[PDB]
Amino acid sequence: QVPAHIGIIMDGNGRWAKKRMQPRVFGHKAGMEALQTVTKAANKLGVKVITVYAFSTENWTRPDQEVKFIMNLPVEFYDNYVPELHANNVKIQMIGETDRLPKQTFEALTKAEELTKNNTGLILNFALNYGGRAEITQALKLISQDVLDAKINPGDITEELIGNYLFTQHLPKDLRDPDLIIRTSGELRLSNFLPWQGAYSELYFTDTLWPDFDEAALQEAILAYNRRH
Amino acid sequence: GSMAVEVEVPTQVPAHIGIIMDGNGRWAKKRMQPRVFGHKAGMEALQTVTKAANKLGVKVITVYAFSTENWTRPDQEVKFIMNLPVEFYDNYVPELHANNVKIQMIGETDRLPKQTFEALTKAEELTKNNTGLILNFALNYGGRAEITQALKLISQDVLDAKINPGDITEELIGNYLFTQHLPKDLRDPDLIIRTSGELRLSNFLPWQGAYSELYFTDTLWPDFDEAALQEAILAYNRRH
Ligand SMILES: Cc1onc(-c2ccccc2Cl)c1C(=O)Nc1ccc(C(C)C)cc1
Ligand SMILES: Cc1onc(-c2ccccc2Cl)c1C(=O)Nc1ccc(C(C)C)cc1
């Protein structure tokens, strides 16, 4: 009675900070608290995957001081969240052009992956330096190279093959596509998040800002989802 | 205690609108009519919306007329749907042409019945010089299948040394999608409307619609009129 894979666009961190007379960066720290709550609660509820839109390709255009702060969050606050998620049997993974992340950020995410790699509970999947069209492009580029290198023929080119070349290929086969996509902070649009995988997803929009998105809010999103069927 | 006064307010009209025309069958069944009666009523709604959007300054309307999954519906229902542009051509096309509307289609349109394809081709050829709104029918269309065929064509061009794999970019992919014949700055919908209360993605323009505004209404497609389109444009204006 729960969606197996939930995609989340965690909007409203800056707006939340602003409403509280705090610098925008504080909102992103508060967003980590909300994700911790949602990840733990979704794991208890039976959700298999959460893919979060943690950092888009367009987020690099934000002020340098803001990007640096955001990139430092898994580095500085690793001990505050990761051991607890691991104790909760949560598996941490990432998708995106993650090689372009600062050395320390990549190291912090890799350390968290390696720690939780044997965990059998919910997969918390971070979309980092991620863009949907860029993901499809790199898949379509690789398939072309494989075709040119005779590893596959052009008759092998199918929707199923494309799915195996997307960043989501490492998720179990039946769990690659989100059943539900949640978007907070009232924006009614996808912003290049999982365009291929989310082509049939149910969509849930809330005016609730991401740092305020808790267990009760996730239970509402799940309740609405089950009412769609 | 209030007074009715008109105000001059600047509103941005979306250049390209995508529409998933859901609720034809629900509309007909509600009126104790067979589902097929609803699809005929859907033609009336599209005529109203197309003419009104053309006057409003909308450049493109891409409608989800027939998906790849719609072939699974009962044979007599599919046959009736396929016959609509064949039998009712004179009822809509000359009027759209008189309104300077350009008719186009996207999808695996070679798989359409001979008569259907002929009726759509006749409408394309008639309106090909028209400079107003482009009414673009997505027929035998699936988003993932569209992306797949674009790769099938791209890999073959790499193999034939027409392009190298380093030429593979987002811009190139856009030139291989079914929407390639729309002017380059108009290929992507600015707004996607979905009627009949479903809040879901249905494999409609996944690449092109990646940044679109989304508008959902409980209004059934045959009941979607000018006032309803104006509300959707109104909603689009109040976004980020
Ligand atoms: C909540 C939460 O639970 N665990 C993490 C985590 C995951 C991997 C490494 C370190 C941490 Cl703190 C985590 C979290 O919010 N991580 C996070 C925070 C910010 C970013 C930036 C790089 C966009 C990336 C990951
Ligand atoms: C409104 C409207 O205005 N003109 C058409 C039209 C467009 C092309 C050919 C013939 C017609 Cl009647 C039209 C319309 O509803 N066309 C239509 C209706 C149904 C179908 C089926 C095959 C899905 C395909 C096209």
* B144 and A159 Cβ atoms separated by less than 8 Å: yes
Tokens coding B25: 């069958």
> At which residue do the structure tokens 């720690």 appear?
A115
Query: In sequence order, what are the residues at sequence separation of 6 or more whose Cβ sits closer than 8 angstroms to the Cβ of residue B202?
Result: A199, A200, B20, B64, B67, B194
Name A8's bridge partners: A52, A182
Distances (CA, A) of B84 to B33, B39, B66, B127: 17, 8, 12, 19
Surface-to-core class of residue A174, CB atoms within 10 Å of its CB (0-12 exposed, 13-18 middle, 19+ buried): exposed
Instruction: Calculate the alpha carbon distances from A3 to A42, A225, B197 in Å.
Output: 10, 8, 20
Q: Three-class SS string for chain A?
A: CCCCEEEEECCCHHHHHHHCCCCHHHHHHHHHHHHHHHHHHHHHHCCCEEEEEEEEHHHHHCCHHHHHHHHHHHHHCHHHHHHHHHHCCCEEEEECCHHHCCHHHHHHHHHHHHHHCCCCCCEEEEEEEECHHHHHHHHHHHHHHHHHCCCCCHHHCCHHHHHHHCHHHHCCHHHCCCCEEEECCCCCECCCCCCCCCCCCEEEECCCCHHHCCHHHHHHHHHHHHHCC
Stated resolution in angstroms: 2.2
Q: Are strands B102-106 and A202-205 parallel, antiparallel or unpaired?
A: unpaired
Distance in angstroms (rounded) separating the CA atoms of residues B43 and B97: 16
A62 assigned binding-site residue = yes
DSSP chain B: -----------PPPSEEEEE---HHHHHHHTT--HHHHHHHHHHHHHHHHHHHHHHT--EEEEEEEEGGGGGS-HHHHHHHHHHHHHTHHHHHHHHHHTTPEEEEESSGGGS-HHHHHHHHHHHHHHTT--S-EEEEEEEE-HHHHHHHHHHHHHHHHHTTSS-GGG--HHHHHHHSGGGGS-GGGSS-SEEEE-TT--B--SSSTTTTTT-EEEE-SS-GGG--HHHHHHHHHHHHT--
Burial of A182 (0-12, 13-18, 19+ CB in 10 A): buried
Domain at B198, CATH number:
3.40.1180.10
**Closest alpha carbon within chain B to A202:** B200
- Residues A65, B125: Cα–Cα separation, whole Å: 56
Question: What are residue B20's DSSP bridge partners?
Answer: B194
- Number of domains making up chain B: 1
Which chain A residue has its CA at the smallest distance from B156's CA? A154
Q: How far, in Å, are A179, A213, B187 from residue A73 at the CA level? A: 29, 19, 38
Handedness of CA B41, B47, B50, B52 (dihedral sign): negative
Q: Do B201 and A204 touch (CB under 8 A)?
A: no
Given a contact cutoff of 8 angstroms between Cβ atoms, the answer to whether A33 and A39 are in contact is: no
Q: For residue B230, what are its two tokens?
A: 């104006």
All residues of chain A having their beta carbon less than 8 Å from the beta carbon of residue B151 are 140, 143-144, 157, 162
Per the structure block, which two tokens stand in for B112? 């359409």
CB contact under 8 A, A202 and B199: yes
Contacts of A204 in chain B (CB under 8 A): 199
Measured from the alpha carbon of residue B141, the closest ligand is: 2
Taking CA–CA distances from A205, the nearest residue in chain B reads B199
A53 alpha carbon to ligand 1 midpoint, in Å? Answer: 11
Buried b (16+ CB within 10 A) or exposed e, B115-144: ebbebbeebeebbeebebbbbbbbbbbbbb
For residue B239, how many other CB atoms are within 10 A of its CB? 15
Residues within a 6 A CB radius of ligand 1: A 32, 35-36, 54-55, 70-71, 73-74, 77-78, 81-82, 85, 92, 105, 108-109, 112, 126, 128
Q: How far is it, in rounded angstroms, from Cα A23 to Cα A18?
A: 7
Spatial separation of the C-alpha atoms in residues B34 and B26, rounded to whole Å: 10
* Domain containing residue B24: 1-240
Helix axes B35-56, B226-237, angle to 10 degrees: 60
**Phi and psi torsions of B203, nearest 5°:** 65, 30
Task: With beta carbons less than 8 A apart as the criterion, state whether B206 and B147 touch.
Answer: yes
Q: Is A226 labelled a binding residue? A: no
The three-point CA angle B24-B26-B31 to 5° equals 100
Interface test with A, best of B141, B176, B201 (most A CBs within 10 A): B201
B5 touches chain A (CB under 8 A): no
What's the CA gap between B80 and B77, in Å, rounded?
Answer: 5
Q: Going edge to edge, which strands form the sheet with A49-56?
A: A91-95, A123-130, A49-56, A5-9, A180-183, A202-205
Tally Cβ neighbours within 10 Å of residue B164.
Answer: 11
Q: End-to-end alpha-carbon separation of chain B, Å?
A: 33
Burial label for A63, CB within 10 Å (0-12, 13-18, 19+), is: exposed
CA A202 to CA B199: how far, in whole Å? 6
Query: A24: which 2 tokens?
Result: 């925008």
Residue with tokens 């998040």: A193
Q: Which residues pair with A183 in a beta bridge?
A: A9, A205
A188 in contact with B, Cβ within 8 Å:
yes
